[PDB]
């Protein structure tokens, strides 16, 4: 079917999102969002992350997994642990992929930086990161800001039913 994404948690629940940023946090495009459910810092009871859509798995490492849709769009999930699938496996929307890591070393098993447990979520097409601007997730339109991680709610927000949800506010599926 047509590529459609859902927020990687259950209907009627909320997590929190930061502002849109590139995969590295510098430069363009703003392809990525950091999601967390507010469980706390390192060592806390971090949640399981659901596949935003169906597709074929690529497992890059113990902390880095991707779901590639039949359309060639894909979502990438970084800072992960307890990964449940291997290369070539098929998953459905909602499938539990793993947890986002509750330990600092596991979260950064391929490098990067982190201030606390979260999943770094990235949209790709043809294996290349692509901008989240004007893309949709759980029927929210994503409006990217004017710099990496920009959380100004006049610049960055999720919009559904004509109402905005800002970064660092309950984002309900
Ligand atoms: Zn990130």
Residue numbers in the entry: 1 to 173
Please quote the authors directly.
Unlike Halobacteriovorax species that are intracellular predators, strain CF6-2 is an extracellular predator, which kills Gram-positive bacteria by secreting an extracellular protease, pseudoalterin, that degrades the PG in the prey’s cell wall. (ii) Pseudoalterin can bind to the glycan strand of Gram-positive bacterial PG with its C-terminal domain and degrade the PG peptide with its catalytic domain. Pseudoalterin preferred to cleave the bonds with Gly/Ala at P1 and P1′ positions and, to a lesser extent, to the bonds with larger amino acids at these positions. In the meantime, the released glycine and glycine-enriching oligopeptides from the degradation of Gram-positive bacterial PG induce the synthesis of pseudoalterin in strain CF6-2, and then the synthesized pseudoalterin is secreted through the T2SS of strain CF6-2.
To better understand the molecular interaction between pseudoalterin and PG, the crystal structure of pseudoalterin was determined to 1.9 Å. The sequence identity of pseudoalterin to the M23 peptidases LasA and lysostaphin is 54% and 15%, respectively. The catalytic domain of pseudoalterin, comprising five β-strands and four connecting loops (loop 1–loop 4), is quite similar to those of LasA and lysostaphin, with a root mean square deviation (RMSD) of 0.64 and 4.0 Å, respectively. H21, D34, and H120 chelating the zinc ion in pseudoalterin are equivalent to H210, D214, and H293 that chelate the zinc ion in LytM21. Among them, either H79 or H118 can act as a general base/acid in PG hydrolysis based on sequence alignment of pseudoalterin with its homologs (LasA, LytM, lysostaphin, and ALE-1), and mutation of these two residues to alanine almost completely abolished pseudoalterin activity to PG. In the model of the pseudoalterin: (NAG–NAM)2 binary complex (NAG, N-acetylglucosamine; NAM, N-acetylmuramic acid), the glycan strand (NAG–NAM)2 interacts with the C-terminal domain. Analysis of the model indicated that (NAG–NAM)2 interacts with the C-terminal domain mainly by forming H-bonds with the residues H133, N134, Y136, R141, D143, N154, Y157, E159, R163, and R164. The catalytic cavity of pseudoalterin is similar to those of LasA and LytM, and more open than that of lysostaphin, which suggests that, like these homologs, pseudoalterin also prefers to bind Gly/Ala. In addition, compared to LasA, the side chain of Q113 of loop 3 of pseudoalterin makes the S1 pocket much deeper, and may be capable of orienting the long side chain of amino acids. Thus, in addition to Gly and Ala, the deeper and more open catalytic cavity of pseudoalterin may accommodate residues with a longer side chain such as Lys and Glu in PG.
